[PDB]
Design an enzyme around this catalytic site. Structure first.
Site, PDB file in Angstrom:
ATOM      1  N   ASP A   1      -5.991   6.346  -5.566  1.00 40.24           N
ATOM      2  CA  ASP A   1      -5.292   5.358  -4.790  1.00 40.24           C
ATOM      3  C   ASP A   1      -5.164   5.203  -6.598  1.00 40.24           C
ATOM      4  O   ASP A   1      -5.774   5.698  -7.679  1.00 40.24           O
ATOM      5  CB  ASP A   1      -5.951   4.302  -4.150  1.00 40.24           C
ATOM      6  CG  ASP A   1      -7.758   4.171  -4.598  1.00 40.24           C
ATOM      7  OD1 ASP A   1      -7.872   4.270  -5.384  1.00 40.24           O
ATOM      8  OD2 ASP A   1      -8.360   3.229  -3.720  1.00 40.24           O
TER       9      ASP A   1
ATOM     10  N   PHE B   1      -8.348  -6.249   2.496  1.00 40.77           N
ATOM     11  CA  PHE B   1      -7.963  -4.306   2.998  1.00 40.77           C
ATOM     12  C   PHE B   1      -8.067  -4.248   0.848  1.00 40.77           C
ATOM     13  O   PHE B   1      -8.858  -2.955   1.511  1.00 40.77           O
ATOM     14  CB  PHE B   1      -6.478  -4.735   3.368  1.00 40.77           C
ATOM     15  CG  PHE B   1      -6.020  -3.295   3.838  1.00 40.77           C
ATOM     16  CD1 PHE B   1      -5.898  -3.490   5.061  1.00 40.77           C
ATOM     17  CD2 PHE B   1      -5.607  -2.630   3.126  1.00 40.77           C
ATOM     18  CE1 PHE B   1      -5.814  -2.177   5.760  1.00 40.77           C
ATOM     19  CE2 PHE B   1      -4.995  -1.757   3.636  1.00 40.77           C
ATOM     20  CZ  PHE B   1      -5.415  -1.076   4.419  1.00 40.77           C
TER      21      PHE B   1
ATOM     22  N   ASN C   1      -6.991 -20.050 -10.651  1.00 36.89           N
ATOM     23  CA  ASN C   1      -8.341 -19.327 -10.710  1.00 36.89           C
ATOM     24  C   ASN C   1      -8.545 -18.010 -10.190  1.00 36.89           C
ATOM     25  O   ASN C   1      -8.630 -17.108 -10.653  1.00 36.89           O
ATOM     26  CB  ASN C   1      -9.305 -20.156 -10.264  1.00 36.89           C
ATOM     27  CG  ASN C   1     -10.632 -20.059  -9.628  1.00 36.89           C
ATOM     28  OD1 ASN C   1     -10.694 -19.090  -9.043  1.00 36.89           O
ATOM     29  ND2 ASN C   1     -11.199 -20.663 -10.901  1.00 36.89           N
TER      30      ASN C   1
ATOM     31  N   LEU D   1      -8.253   4.004   2.916  1.00 37.70           N
ATOM     32  CA  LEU D   1      -9.468   4.739   1.443  1.00 37.70           C
ATOM     33  C   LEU D   1     -10.721   6.392   1.790  1.00 37.70           C
ATOM     34  O   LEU D   1     -10.526   5.248   3.167  1.00 37.70           O
ATOM     35  CB  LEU D   1     -10.578   3.505   1.392  1.00 37.70           C
ATOM     36  CG  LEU D   1     -11.672   3.747   0.460  1.00 37.70           C
ATOM     37  CD1 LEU D   1     -11.368   4.484  -0.850  1.00 37.70           C
ATOM     38  CD2 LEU D   1     -12.255   3.069  -0.608  1.00 37.70           C
TER      39      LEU D   1
ATOM     40  N   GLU E   1       1.022  -1.308  -0.193  1.00 39.54           N
ATOM     41  CA  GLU E   1      -0.234   0.062  -0.035  1.00 39.54           C
ATOM     42  C   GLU E   1       0.679   1.076   0.166  1.00 39.54           C
ATOM     43  O   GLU E   1       0.213   2.535  -0.263  1.00 39.54           O
ATOM     44  CB  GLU E   1      -0.992  -0.035   0.992  1.00 39.54           C
ATOM     45  CG  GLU E   1      -1.966  -0.755   1.411  1.00 39.54           C
ATOM     46  CD  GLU E   1      -3.183  -0.813   0.355  1.00 39.54           C
ATOM     47  OE1 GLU E   1      -2.843  -0.573  -0.668  1.00 39.54           O
ATOM     48  OE2 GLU E   1      -3.936  -1.720  -0.261  1.00 39.54           O
TER      49      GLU E   1
ATOM     50  N   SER F   1     -12.884 -19.909  -6.053  1.00 39.17           N
ATOM     51  CA  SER F   1     -11.211 -19.803  -5.501  1.00 39.17           C
ATOM     52  C   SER F   1     -10.988 -20.240  -3.667  1.00 39.17           C
ATOM     53  O   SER F   1     -10.140 -20.522  -3.655  1.00 39.17           O
ATOM     54  CB  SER F   1     -10.499 -18.194  -5.593  1.00 39.17           C
ATOM     55  OG  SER F   1     -10.583 -17.696  -7.327  1.00 39.17           O
TER      56      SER F   1
END
Ligand SMILES: CC(=O)OCc1ccccc1
Length: 162
Positions: free
Chosen positions: A20, A104, A132, A32, A11, A117
């Site tokens: 972002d 996250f 996948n 965010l 990040e 998945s």
């Protein structure tokens, strides 16, 4: 290596409001603020989050406080999600970090899209799960980060973060 160090790599750390990867106003370590295109709306969210008038700028300590809150909330969200909890609980500690990382970044709205998945991860079919996971908007839009997270899911090691 731990979840904080991992997400700090993925990040970054910026002390002023920035956009972002999706063009959304963000600050700190991937915090965010809003999906609104209005910078003033983002500034309001920031002031509310920090509890003072920041005018779009925070300190490293403040960034790290939001990060602690955000990681905590991500993990707890996983545990409160009926689809995610059993898969998370089936994982080892390193692969759990990959799960927290993905939540996250993406939140929980697309969980159903990752149904297949998630099943493969719970079955511990690691190479299949990795294949996948890459068949996704997530992978295509942030491929280098997704590759790191997928390698973590595939191997249960920190090889992608060194
Ligand atoms: C939707 C998703 O893949 O979030 C990550 C994740 C993976 C395994 C267990 C919980 C959450």
């Amino acid at each position: 290596m731990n979840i904080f160090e991992m997400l700090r790599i993925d990040e970054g750390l910026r002390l002023k409001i920035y956009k972002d990867t999706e063009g959304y106003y963000t600050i700190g370590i991937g915090h965010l603020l809003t999906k609104s295109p209005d910078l003033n709306a983002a500034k309001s969210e920031l002031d509310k989050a920090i509890g003072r008038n920041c005018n779009g700028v925070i300190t490293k300590d403040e960034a790290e406080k939001l990060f602690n809150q955000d990681v905590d909330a991500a993990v707890r969200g996983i545990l409160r999600n009926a689809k995610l909890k059993p898969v998370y609980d089936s994982l080892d500690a390193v692969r759990r970090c990959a799960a927290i990382n993905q939540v996250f970044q993406m939140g929980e709205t697309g969980v159903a899209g990752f149904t297949n998945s998630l099943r493969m991860l719970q079955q511990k079919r690691w190479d299949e799960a990795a294949v996948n996971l890459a068949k996704s908007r997530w992978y295509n839009q942030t491929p280098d980060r997704a590759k790191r997270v997928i390698t973590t899911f595939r191997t249960g090691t920190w090889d992608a973060y060194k």
